[PDB]
Amino acid sequence: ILENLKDVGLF
Amino acid sequence: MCGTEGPNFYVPFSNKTGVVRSPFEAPQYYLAEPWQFSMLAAYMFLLIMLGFPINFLTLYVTVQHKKLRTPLNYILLNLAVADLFMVFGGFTTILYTSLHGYFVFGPTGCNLEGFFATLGGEIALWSLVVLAIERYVVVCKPMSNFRFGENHAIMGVAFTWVMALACAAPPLVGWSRYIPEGMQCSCGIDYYTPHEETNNESFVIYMFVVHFIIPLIVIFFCYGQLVFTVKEAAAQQQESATTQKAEKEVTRMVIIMVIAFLICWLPYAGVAFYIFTHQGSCFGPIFMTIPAFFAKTSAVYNPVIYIMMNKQFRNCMVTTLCCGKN
Ligand SMILES: *[C@@H]1O[C@H](CO)[C@@H](O[C@@H]2O[C@H](CO)[C@@H](O[C@@H]3O[C@H](CO)[C@@H](O)[C@H](O[C@H]4O[C@H](CO)[C@@H](O)[C@H](O)[C@@H]4O)[C@@H]3O)[C@H](O)[C@H]2NC(C)=O)[C@H](O)[C@H]1NC(C)=O
Ligand SMILES: *C/C=C(C)/C=C/C=C(C)/C=C/C1=C(C)CCCC1(C)C
Ligand SMILES: CCCCCCCCO[C@@H]1O[C@H](CO)[C@@H](O)[C@H](O)[C@H]1O
Ligand SMILES: CCCCCCCCO[C@@H]1O[C@H](CO)[C@@H](O)[C@H](O)[C@H]1O
Ligand SMILES: *C(=O)CCCCCCCCCCCCCCC
Ligand SMILES: *C(=O)CCCCCCCCCCCCCCC
Numbered sequence: 133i134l135e136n137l138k139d140v141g142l143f
Numbered sequence: 144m145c146g147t148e149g150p151n152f153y154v155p156f157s158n159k160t161g162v163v164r165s166p167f168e169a170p171q172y173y174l175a176e177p178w179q180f181s182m183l184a185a186y187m188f189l190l191i192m193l194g195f196p197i198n199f200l201t202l203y204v205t206v207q208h209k210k211l212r213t214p215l216n217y218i219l220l221n222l223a224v225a226d227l228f229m230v231f232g233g234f235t236t237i238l239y240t241s242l243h244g245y246f247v248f249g250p251t252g253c254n255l256e257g258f259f260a261t262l263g264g265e266i267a268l269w270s271l272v273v274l275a276i277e278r279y280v281v282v283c284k285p286m287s288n289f290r291f292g293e294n295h296a297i298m299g300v301a302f303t304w305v306m307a308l309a310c311a312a313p314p315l316v317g318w319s320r321y322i323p324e325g326m327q328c329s330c331g332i333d334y335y336t337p338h339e340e341t342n343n344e345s346f347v348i349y350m351f352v353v354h355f356i357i358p359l360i361v362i363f364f365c366y367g368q369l370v371f372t373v374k375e376a377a378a379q380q381q382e383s384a385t386t387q388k389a390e391k392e393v394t395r396m397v398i399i400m401v402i403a404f405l406i407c408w409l410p411y412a413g414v415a416f417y418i419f420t421h422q423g424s425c426f427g428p429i430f431m432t433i434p435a436f437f438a439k440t441s442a443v444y445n446p447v448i449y450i451m452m453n454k455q456f457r458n459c460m461v462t463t464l465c466c467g468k469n
Pocket of ligand 3: 170242244
């Protein structure tokens, strides 16, 4: 789920 | 008997001494000293000096870095464009008029500067909403087999423009109106005068509900979930020091975004409401300026939070700012 945090600009 | 009315305006000063003049015709130096007009001008100068570079860079860097041109980023660019509507439509006009002591462009100008300033602020506003929806959709995955793609990002953007027109257009055509506010050097929605011929009463309710409450609820729900989802994951995966880090960073950022949103719009909503429910009370020019100082300053702080604190944009900016290198 970190992939999606990276995508979304939050991690 | 609190100010002075005329056809397209409301000056927050009693005309018992005969001194009040149309804020489209002559300096309002009885509302506030000239040095305070100059500080108003100094503040618009600061907002331009910071806001134009930050927001312009954001666009420029997107042109130079392929990796930034994804769909999840379109709404961030949309934000920066909106910040620029506020910079050129609002801030520059106001710098100019502040230094005359009044709204030299007259009523037509007052509609223009009000429409473009309001459109920008609203596109920014709804862009912060659409962003949270998109993140929630992508991370909480409230719909299985859904993939966020270009065609959606486009609707997201267009929806911000539709909603922002739904706020800025009506006062151009009879539902509320644009007039000079505060020190009368800028123009916005009439949310403080009851003006039956344009039905301000109901507009301010529509605004309060549709353009503050809905946004506030959508932002809180979407990000409440996001923080829930990520806290869940990390609890269920305490063996990943990374995932623990992620959870902390996401949560700090949500608190920042949520507090930031409030700082920007709570004062306008707080004031609209106090005034609506204290109709027999007198609100001077500097007090009507406070809501605006908070909202307009977001053309700087929003892109710090949303763009400069985003690792990708930041590295691209530093690269582009270091001539090609780093
Ligand atoms: C705040 O209060 C002030 C004081 O009331 C107010 O300013 C006044 O506006 C009136 C007009 O609506 C001005 O009247 C003019 O006086 C001069 C002579 O010195 C003449 O040029 C004009 O005469 C014509 O108009 C009259 C009818 O109004 C006729 O009697 C005459 O025959 C001519 O047709 C006109 O009288 C007045 O001078 C000013 N006074 C001051 C101190 O400025 C101001 O409008 C108020 N503010 C707001 C925002 O409304
Ligand atoms: C420079 C001045 C600007 C950007 C003013 C914009 C004002 C708004 C978009 C205000 C909207 C609201 C009301 C008028 C009252 C209820 C609360 C809001 C924020 C929805
Ligand atoms: C950065 C942009 C510069 C704007 C120049 C502002 C010019 C102000 O113009 C001033 O307005 C007075 C009214 O108060 C007039 O009496 C004078 O004609 C003039 O000095
Ligand atoms: C609308 C979104 C609401 C924000 C949810 C905030 C969650 C509060 O939760 C707290 O946040 C702290 C800051 O990182 C953590 O360190 C605490 O241990 C955590 O429980
Ligand atoms: C290469 O990457 C060069 C980096 C320097 C680019 C210039 C940065 C401009 C900074 C403006 C001043 C703002 C700081 C305000 C803090 C209060
Ligand atoms: C490569 O093309 C550019 C590298 C330039 C190095 C950055 C120099 C730092 C200057 C900071 C500017 C602060 C400006 C204050 C304005 C009021």
